[PDB]
Amino acid sequence: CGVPAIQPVLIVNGEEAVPGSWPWQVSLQDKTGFHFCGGSLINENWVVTAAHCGVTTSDVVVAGEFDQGSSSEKIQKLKIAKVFKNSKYNSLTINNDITLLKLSTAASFSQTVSAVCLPSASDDFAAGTTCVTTGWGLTRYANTPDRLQQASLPLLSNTNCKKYWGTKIKDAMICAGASGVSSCMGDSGGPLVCKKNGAWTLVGIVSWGSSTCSTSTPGVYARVTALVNWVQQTLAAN
Amino acid sequence: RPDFCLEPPYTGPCGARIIRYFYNAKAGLCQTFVYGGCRAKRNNFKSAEDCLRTCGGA
């Protein structure tokens, strides 16, 4: 996990990604092919995304995609067998914003399709650490970009984040950004990854933030370290 | 009809791109808009039918 067969070269104000350089990035679409959220493959049978995305078993997981405007591009449209929304997801505060998707048929891993690593509950990714977020969300706050985008951004300390969002920042949230880039409409559920011993590890899941996708405002993500025990437990039980 | 039917559509702070319906009093019908996934106001429906049954004529 965390090691792309195709190395990446390093969302508002981000840049186009190298095709297939973020192999765990998936597109969550409805039965018609409409992209409503992103997600991350954690293994061949499971995808992690945001609880607010409201994924259902009628939706599909699209892996190995780069250009959503290309009909010829080879991709994997995977059916969803069951949706596991974290029962602690708070629809009011948006805390514990995570959901697991168990695929009906396993994804076929390859040079453009593979898993991201998961952190340990005790992992500490220091503030200021440069991480990356990816997705097909808006690049301007309007239709989504066809090609997968990426952006490098720093993690923010809770103290620094709270300087803007105050008490809206909860324990299962981690902030990043306010650095000239911003996740935006359509990026939700996607990954916020940081390197752990060289391997890209899922530190956050795009959740919420500025209602205008401001690049000078902290973006808020579901803190994976605070939710990974729930993840492992769900996989072990299913 | 409920006054919430007269409120403009509300996307919210979450970053999803979910298609929902809202009643547009200026046009007299329900239209689509993109909902962010959280903190939906009441003029937000999963189908045009639900929207028209709740806000039609507002």
Curated annotation (Swiss-Prot), chain A:
Q: Can you cite an annotated GO cellular component?
A: extracellular region
What name does UniProt use for this protein? Chymotrypsinogen A
Main location as per UniProt: secreted
Q: Which PANTHER family match?
A: CHYMOTRYPSIN-LIKE PROTEASE CTRL-1, CHYMOTRYPSIN-RELATED
GO process annotations (BP):
digestion; proteolysis
Catalytic positions are 52, 97, 188
By sequence similarity, the record places it as follows:
Belongs to the peptidase S1 family.
As for subcellular location, the record says: Secreted, Extracellular space
User: What superkingdom heads the lineage?
Assistant: Eukaryota
Q: Record's InterPro entries?
A: Peptidase_S1_PA (IPR009003), Peptidase_S1_PA_chymotrypsin (IPR043504), Peptidase_S1A (IPR001314), Trypsin_dom (IPR001254), TRYPSIN_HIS (IPR018114), TRYPSIN_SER (IPR033116)
From Swiss-Prot, chain B:
Origin superkingdom: Eukaryota
User: What's in the keyword line of the UniProt record?
Assistant: Disulfide bond, Pharmaceutical, Protease inhibitor, Secreted, Serine protease inhibitor, Signal
Annotated positions for site Reactive bond for trypsin? 15-16
The residue ranges of the BPTI/Kunitz inhibitor domain are: 5-55
Summarizing the function annotation, the protein's role is: Inhibits trypsin, kallikrein, chymotrypsin, and plasmin.
Question: Could you provide one GO biological process annotation from this protein's UniProt record?
Answer: negative regulation of thrombin-activated receptor signaling pathway
In Swiss-Prot or TrEMBL terms, this protein is called: Pancreatic trypsin inhibitor
- The disulfide bonds in this chain are 5-55, 14-38, 30-51
Gene Ontology CC entries for this record: extracellular space; serine protease inhibitor complex
**What is this organism's lineage?**
Eukaryota, Metazoa, Chordata, Craniata, Vertebrata
Q: Name one molecular function that GO assigns to this entry.
A: zymogen binding
Query: Secreted as a keyword?
Result: yes
- Where is this gene product found? Secreted
